[PDB]
Design a binder for this molecule. Structure first.
Ligand SMILES: *[C@@H]1O[C@H](CO)[C@@H](O[C@@H]2O[C@H](CO)[C@@H](O[C@@H]3O[C@H](CO)[C@@H](O)[C@H](O)[C@@H]3O)[C@H](O)[C@H]2NC(C)=O)[C@H](O)[C@H]1NC(C)=O
Ligand SMILES: *[C@@H]1O[C@H](CO)[C@@H](O)[C@H](O)[C@H]1NC(C)=O
Ligand SMILES: *[C@@H]1O[C@H](CO)[C@@H](O)[C@H](O)[C@H]1NC(C)=O
Ligand SMILES: *[C@@H]1O[C@H](CO)[C@@H](O)[C@H](O)[C@H]1NC(C)=O
Ligand SMILES: *[C@@H]1O[C@H](CO)[C@@H](O)[C@H](O)[C@H]1NC(C)=O
Ligand SMILES: *[C@@H]1O[C@H](CO)[C@@H](O)[C@H](O)[C@H]1NC(C)=O
Ligand SMILES: *[C@@H]1O[C@H](CO)[C@@H](O)[C@H](O)[C@H]1NC(C)=O
Ligand SMILES: *[C@@H]1O[C@H](CO)[C@@H](O)[C@H](O)[C@H]1NC(C)=O
Ligand SMILES: *[C@@H]1O[C@H](CO)[C@@H](O)[C@H](O)[C@H]1NC(C)=O
Ligand SMILES: *[C@@H]1O[C@H](CO)[C@@H](O)[C@H](O)[C@H]1NC(C)=O
Ligand SMILES: *[C@@H]1O[C@H](CO)[C@@H](O)[C@H](O)[C@H]1NC(C)=O
Ligand SMILES: *[C@@H]1O[C@H](CO)[C@@H](O)[C@H](O)[C@H]1NC(C)=O
Ligand SMILES: *[C@@H]1O[C@H](CO)[C@@H](O)[C@H](O)[C@H]1NC(C)=O
Ligand code: NA
Ligand code: NA
Ligand code: NA
Lengths: 347, 208, 216
């Protein structure tokens, strides 16, 4: 017997103590080592309700990631309200590592194992664990990177699909690689991401078909973001310590999704990106300025494992639904990895 | 995509009466429905959120209930200040509204007709006005006849809000035609139909 | 349930733009509720237009606005701005901003409202009213206030001394694009011949003043 409860979790990781990489450094002091042989127990004939959208594990991960960034990614200048902080801003080593979240004594984590569980409601196949799987704290917009994949079908998650003010998370069942490069030796801030067009359009087609199931077979349309700061109108992420902004107009290109045999739908899709020194902080604390990019080839090869979407509002839309990349906030990135977990207190 | 059917479209009740309005949703919506009050010339005011939670400050006479597809808003003991339009909301879609009115004893309108002024005719236009004063209920019909010829399309009217004390309405109808069209016919008549009348009423004048 | 503060009334020609601003906080935790914009045309239903996330500028525009609308916020994230481009006559409406209460998780339950910003789109130019008498036959009388733009006019009788039994009707918009209204009052039939009745008309938009004596 038990009941849903909130408590202070602790983290575990395989961080390297001698490493200068900032995630390793944070985790060496903030987390304990991993349990070699973790215990998992199927709970027979147990049904349990989950809600990924009201899950306090998410708040705790958020605090941790904010704290990691606060002590690892100091800007040269920080502009908050009327306070101007000019500090030092050395280039760092940056590459996220898996972090496990673990319950204390008296508590345990219940884990949903239903192959197509959508994040809310009853789970039929439930087990108990002491820690979650290893979650990389990847901060990105629009595209979810280096995450875990849905086990069977593509899955659509939302607190309310009919609610245009609620974020939609698409969880992919097959990853698509995005290869982002800032070459050496012409602006030093100019960069680009390559994506296999054949591979991407196949997946996006499956996503549209999945959305058709939820929206009454209506015509499904993708469009670019309607507005907002560049962090959200573009695919924004951090590669090797540098802040990338990539234009995703070409990824959401209805032309190639109609399945129409069309020219150039195959082959390499090249997105234009910029490395920016002046950024708005995702932590919500105004503008920060950093030093110019390091010299040499800057390269990040990531797996796209998910997509955040917002759906266009307006009553009587009758014939179609339009979705634009980007949605919600960075907490939703953690929700996409924590959706199948919840904490309970053993009584 | 959702469709909310709000009913009735209008109602009238005496002070202290119980009034309820319903909204039916074309699809299950759980409890995601809010209710608003809007008075003439003012912004809406939230009364109830999440189907049944009464908002702070709102008088205790108001209540909402329902879930899934059937939702209601109730005013126990209607008050003068409750005269308003009420409507439900489900995300960006609103119900068509319900105009609440205060019920009084039926009252026929005093009808008056005003010919245009000599001053106005100099400008080449002629406005004839028919006034209906202090009647109830608000529904009323007005037709213009010019030499027994039913006048259509050249007419506009305006109605006042329900009066505070006597709970009555007033309406004006204005007939617009050219100066030339005015100096052609002799008899101008305002024909009124209202419940408080056993039979239609006609006020008229001879151009002269 | 504090009121939000919106900018003042505006008149625009078809094709032009307008910006409606809405102060929703002071320039001094929990996630910020989006700011919503809606409009209501004269004698029409309330219509949702957009929301805007003041934290990052995220927006959602009603499909039927065809991208003619943009919503932004200032740097301190305390004032929202709604720009409507390529205005047409049927954009004429009172525009509102609205917001859920911070203490609540009902994102659409608009506890906070602005006072409203009237926006009028017309090809018509500013013009003072003509005032004609509605001569008496208790007896009724009044003034016809015709052919003005834009709203509003104000009307009093005998410089305010006469308030009892006065009905001043809502203005109607004529097919000419100009507004017109009437103001009537009922009085004793013995008053006529001795008591003077004068409607006083002001039209601020044109700085026009009219005083019209009404007699049989
Ligand atoms: C939707 O729900 C509303 C209320 O939220 C329902 O209204 C009620 O409908 C029933 C008949 O279906 C009425 O029955 C009443 O019973 C009481 C005794 O408990 C009696 O005093 C009344 O005279 C009446 O016989 C009830 O009056 C009515 N409530 C009202 C009008 O306020 C409605 O039926 C539902 N509509 C659907 C499901 O389509
Ligand atoms: C679960 O129920 C099934 C039949 O419903 C039963 O065979 C099984 O033994 C139950 N679980 C146990 C015993 O843990
Ligand atoms: C998820 O599944 C549950 C079934 O209990 C359903 O209530 C909910 O609407 C589903 N959500 C989505 C986004 O499919
Ligand atoms: C991914 O899910 C889609 C349905 O959403 C399905 O058609 C496809 O076969 C799945 N891919 C794999 C590798 O299971
Ligand atoms: C990534 O892109 C760079 C630049 O085009 C290329 O040299 C490299 O081989 C690519 N890597 C992969 C794994 O595709
Ligand atoms: C892109 O992916 C498709 C689908 O697997 C594959 O057939 C094609 O060879 C790839 N293109 C490359 C690797 O250039
Ligand atoms: C949608 O289309 C499928 C065919 O792929 C059909 O079986 C289904 O009933 C349709 N309706 C809805 C609401 O999805
Ligand atoms: C992305 O690129 C397209 C075409 O290259 C451009 O029209 C659009 O404005 C760009 N989006 C952003 C957010 O820069
Ligand atoms: C590649 O693109 C063409 C359309 O231009 C399409 O017909 C084909 O199926 C795509 N992928 C393949 C053949 O794997
Ligand atoms: C969509 O992709 C086609 C290739 O099939 C490309 O030629 C076109 O530029 C794209 N549409 C856009 C960018 O609007
Ligand atoms: C994703 O993981 C790969 C492999 O560990 C890494 O090289 C890459 O930089 C990661 N991408 C991001 C955005 O963290
Ligand atoms: C990306 O996905 C492939 C399999 O699809 C896997 O081999 C690779 O390790 C992944 N990269 C990650 C998880 O960083
Ligand atoms: C929103 O999701 C809830 C589940 O939390 C569901 O009960 C409700 O029907 C949904 N609302 C709408 C308007 O579909
Ligand atoms: Na918890
Ligand atoms: Na922010
Ligand atoms: Na107009």
């Amino acid at each position: 017997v038990w009941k849903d409860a909130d408590t202070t979790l602790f983290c575990a990781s395989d961080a390297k103590a001698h490493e200068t990489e900032v995630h390793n450094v944070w985790a060496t002091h903030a987390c304990v080592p991993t349990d070699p042989n973790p215990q998992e127990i199927h709970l027979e004939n147990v049904t349990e309700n989950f809600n990924m959208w009201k899950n306090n594990m998410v708040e705790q991960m958020q605090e941790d990631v904010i704290s990691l960034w606060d002590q690892s990614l100091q800007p040269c200048v920080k502009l908050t309200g009327g306070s101007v902080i000019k500090q030092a801003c050395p280039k760092i080593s940056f590459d996220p590592i898996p972090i496990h979240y673990c319950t204390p004594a008296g508590y345990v984590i219940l884990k949903c194992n239903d192959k197509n569980f959508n994040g809310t409601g009853p789970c039929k196949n439930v087990s108990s664990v002491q820690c979650t799987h290893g979650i990389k704290p990847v901060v990105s917009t629009q595209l979810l990177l280096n995450g875990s994949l849905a086990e069977e079908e593509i899955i659509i998650r939302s607190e309310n699909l009919t609610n245009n003010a609620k974020t939609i998370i698409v969880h992919l069942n097959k990853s698509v690689e995005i290869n982002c490069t800032r070459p050496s030796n012409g602006d030093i801030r100019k960069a680009y991401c390559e994506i296999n067009g054949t591979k991407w359009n196949k997946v996006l087609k499956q996503v549209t078909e999945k959305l058709k199931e939820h929206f009454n077979n209506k015509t499904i349309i993708f469009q670019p973001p309607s507005g907002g700061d560049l962090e959200i109108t573009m695919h924004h992420f951090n590669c090797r310590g540098e802040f990338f902004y990539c234009n995703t107009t070409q990824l959401f290109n209805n032309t190639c999704i109609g399945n129409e045999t069309m020219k150039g739908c195959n082959g390499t899709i090249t997105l234009p990106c910029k490395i920016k020194q002046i950024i708005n902080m995702w932590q919500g604390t105004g503008q920060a300025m950093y030093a110019p990019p390091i010299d040499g080839k800057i390269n990040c090869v990531s797996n796209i494992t998910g997509i955040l979407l917002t759906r266009d509002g307006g009553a009587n839309n009758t014939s179609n639904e339009t979705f634009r990349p980007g949605g919600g906030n960075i907490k939703d990135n953690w929700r996409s990895e924590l959706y199948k977990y919840k904490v309970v207190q053993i009584e | 995509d959702i469709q909310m059917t709000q009913s009735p479209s209008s109602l009238s009740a005496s002070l202290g009466d119980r009034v309820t309005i319903t909204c039916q949703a074309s699809r299950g919506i759980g409890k995601d429905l809010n209710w608003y009050q809007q008075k003439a010339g003012k912004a809406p005011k939230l009364l109830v959120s999440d189907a049944s939670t009464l908002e702070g400050g709102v008088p205790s006479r108001f209540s909402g209930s329902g879930f899934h597809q059937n939702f209601s808003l109730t005013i126990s003991s209607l008050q003068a200040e409750d005269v308003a339009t009420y409507f439900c909301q489900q995300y960006e879609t609103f119900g068509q509204g319900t105009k609440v009115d205060i019920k009084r004893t039926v009252a026929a309108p005093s009808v008056f007709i005003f010919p245009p002024s000599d001053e106005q005719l100099k400008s080449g236009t002629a406005s004839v006005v028919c006034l209906l004063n202090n009647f109830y209920p608000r529904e009323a019909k007005v037709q213009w006849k010019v030499d027994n010829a039913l006048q259509s399309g050249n007419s506009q009217e305006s109605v006042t809000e329900q009066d505070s004390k006597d709970s009555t309405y007033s309406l004006s109808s204005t007939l617009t035609l050219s100066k030339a069209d005015y100096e052609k016919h002799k008899v101008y008549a305002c024909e009124v139909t209202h419940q408080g009348l056993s039979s239609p009423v006609t006020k008229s004048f001879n151009r002269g | 349930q504090v009121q939000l503060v919106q900018s003042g009334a505006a008149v625009r020609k078809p094709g032009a733009s307008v910006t409606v601003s809405c102060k929703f906080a002071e320039d001094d935790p929990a996630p910020e509720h989006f700011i919503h914009f809606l409009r209501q045309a004269p004698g029409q239903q309330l219509e949702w237009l957009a929301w805007m996330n003041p934290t990052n500028g995220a927006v959602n525009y009603a499909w039927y606005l065809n991208g003619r609308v943009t919503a932004t916020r200032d740097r301190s994230m305390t004032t929202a701005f709604l720009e409507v481009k390529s205005l047409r006559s049927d954009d004429t409406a009172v525009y509102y901003c609205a917001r859920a209460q911070k203490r609540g998780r009902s994102e659409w339950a608009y506890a906070h409202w602005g006072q409203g910003t009237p926006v009028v789109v017309s090809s018509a130019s500013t013009k003072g009213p003509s005032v004609f008498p509605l001569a008496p036959s208790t007896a009724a009388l009044g003034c016809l206030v015709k052919d003005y733009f834009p709203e509003p006019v104000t009307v009093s009788w005998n410089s305010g001394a006469l308030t009892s039994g006065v009905h001043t009707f809502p203005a109607v918009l004529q097919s000419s694009g100009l507004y017109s209204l009437s103001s009537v009052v009922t009085v004793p039939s013995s008053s006529l011949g001795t008591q003077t009745y004068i409607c006083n008309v002001n039209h601020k938009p044109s700085n026009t003043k009219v005083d019209k004596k009404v007699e049989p």
